Amino acid sequence: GVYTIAEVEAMTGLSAEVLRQWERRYGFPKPRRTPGGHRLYSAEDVEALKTIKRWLEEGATPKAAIRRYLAQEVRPEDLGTGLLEALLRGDLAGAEALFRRGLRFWGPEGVLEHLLLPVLREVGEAWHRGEIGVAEEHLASTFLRARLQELLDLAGFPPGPPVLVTTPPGERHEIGAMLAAYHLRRKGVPALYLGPDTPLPDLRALARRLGAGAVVLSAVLSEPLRALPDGALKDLAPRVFLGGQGAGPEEARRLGAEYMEDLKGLAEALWLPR
Ligand code: B12
Ligand SMILES: [Cl-]
Ligand SMILES: [Cl-]
């Protein structure tokens, strides 16, 4: 069930003014609205506000108290599990807080390996078991993809012609592409992550537009590659690389791309001027 703002004020001791200020300033709580525009708070929120009210009475300040409810109590080893639960619940303010706390323990590489990728993989494993719908999966993936972009920037951006990283059309698995994008930046290659499922005409256009010297594709499934016409990856970039479990030398040769098994060889090839 849910409650009106007048009811929450009586149950918590917090004024309506303060409740609205917190929502505007710290993103919590985040009630839905009636047709009239009136706020409706969940029971979980009310119990959360009672907790926060108690901490304030014990000497805490509003922002820190709210931060403590969203993230700050969770121990480092459980940041991964904590972030996953927040995303499937639709709590993005909580998820952002957990992500921030993660950056307090780890550098960019650490957050990638211990938060983002394990959670994104857990989201997928959950969907495959049918425990979540597509809307939940989309909401979580979009969150994690945006954070990944932020991690890439934290790793620094090398000069030189950019390298576009994505997945073949129809390929929704992007953890390999994400991993490649970061590895390239760490190894000094100006990689730009585009996200998955980039149509070939749009990709060819963007490469010409940005003056990219290379394009990297990650294939987990072998089927989206079999669907592509012969030499469909020929005229995308000066050099076009293909990798992942769903790719091999033969299929790469018939698509007009160069096969790479590991990321180490990929970076070493991108260092070349050709
Ligand atoms: C997460 C996930 C998803 C997520 C994707 C999340 C995301 N945004 O990426 C979601 C939920 C969207 C998903 C959907 C589907 N999935 Co899925 N998914 C998985 C899961 C759990 C993990 C996949 C993964 O992340 N692999 C990790 C890969 C990407 O990276 P890595 O191995 O660590 O990569 C290494 C190397 O390969 C290298 N590498 C990788 N890329 C590159 C690139 C280059 C250039 C180089 C050099 C190297 C390189 O880098 C790493 C070095 O260590 C697997 C099951 C499993 N446990 O494997 C199923 C799985 C991969 N999916 C599968 C399928 C079939 C699908 C669907 C297409 C169909 C379906 N319903 O089952 C749907 C698509 C729905 C749609 N049309 O929208 C099947 C694949 C079967 C097959 N034919 O091989 C699996 C195996 C599940 C199963 N049925 O058993 N999936
Ligand atoms: Cl209201
Ligand atoms: Cl502050």
Side-chain angles (χ1 to χ4, degrees), residues 1-74 76-225 227-233 236-249 251-252 254-273:
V2 315
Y3 304 97
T4 77
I5 195 173
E7 294 171 313
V8 176
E9 178 167 3
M11 298 181 64
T12 62
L14 301 164
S15 69
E17 173 76 5
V18 163
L19 290 171
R20 296 192 301 268
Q21 282 182 342
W22 287 4
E23 172 182 355
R24 190 190 180 101
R25 289 174 175 166
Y26 315 117
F28 180 90
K30 204 53 187 177
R32 78 171 183 90
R33 309 298 178 91
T34 68
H38 310 291
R39 292 170 176 81
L40 286 181
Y41 302 81
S42 69
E44 299 83 297
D45 291 326
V46 166
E47 212 61 39
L49 291 166
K50 285 182 177 178
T51 296
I52 298 169
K53 175 71 174 182
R54 185 181 56 85
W55 289 338
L56 296 181
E57 293 173 348
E58 290 179 4
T61 70
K63 190 181 187 188
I66 295 172
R67 188 178 65 240
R68 180 184 175 182
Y69 175 77
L70 295 179
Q72 209 170 328
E73 268 183 335
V74 186
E77 299 86 354
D78 297 328
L79 278 177
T81 302
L83 179 56
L84 173 63
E85 289 179 349
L87 290 176
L88 305 177
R89 181 207 320 151
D91 182 24
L92 306 188
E96 169 69 9
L98 287 163
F99 176 73
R100 289 287 119 204
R101 178 160 169 81
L103 275 171
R104 194 164 194 273
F105 291 109
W106 309 106
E109 195 170 8
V111 183
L112 179 69
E113 288 181 336
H114 299 338
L115 282 194
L116 292 209
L117 299 183
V119 165
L120 182 53
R121 178 147 190 162
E122 279 285 356
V123 169
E125 288 179 344
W127 183 86
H128 276 318
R129 297 191 301 261
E131 302 180 1
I132 57 178
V134 286
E136 286 110 328
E137 182 274 314
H138 170 93
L139 188 69
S141 294
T142 291
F143 180 93
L144 298 162
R145 186 183 303 115
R147 294 320 178 284
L148 184 272
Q149 299 287 356
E150 184 175 359
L151 293 189
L152 293 174
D153 297 339
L154 275 174
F157 190 59
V163 173
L164 311 189
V165 182
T166 180
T167 71
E171 181 69 76
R172 267 295 160 179
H173 300 87
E174 65 179 301
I175 294 190
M178 288 178 166
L179 203 54
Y182 190 90
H183 183 95
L184 292 181
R185 286 209 181 181
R186 181 175 58 85
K187 281 301 196 67
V189 171
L192 294 174
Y193 185 62
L194 305 182
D197 193 25
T198 300
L200 297 180
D202 299 345
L203 182 58
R204 177 183 291 101
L206 186 59
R208 173 176 57 249
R209 184 180 184 88
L210 303 187
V215 160
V216 175
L217 301 182
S218 177
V220 188
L221 306 178
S222 54
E223 291 75 9
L225 297 182
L228 294 183
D230 306 279
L233 305 181
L236 295 184
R239 284 185 295 174
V240 181
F241 293 88
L242 184 62
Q245 312 170 30
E251 191 68 15
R254 86 160 197 86
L255 285 177
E258 315 170 27
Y259 177 75
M260 274 288 173
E261 178 171 344
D262 43 32
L263 298 181
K264 182 169 178 297
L266 179 65
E268 290 180 4
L270 286 173
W271 287 338
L272 301 176

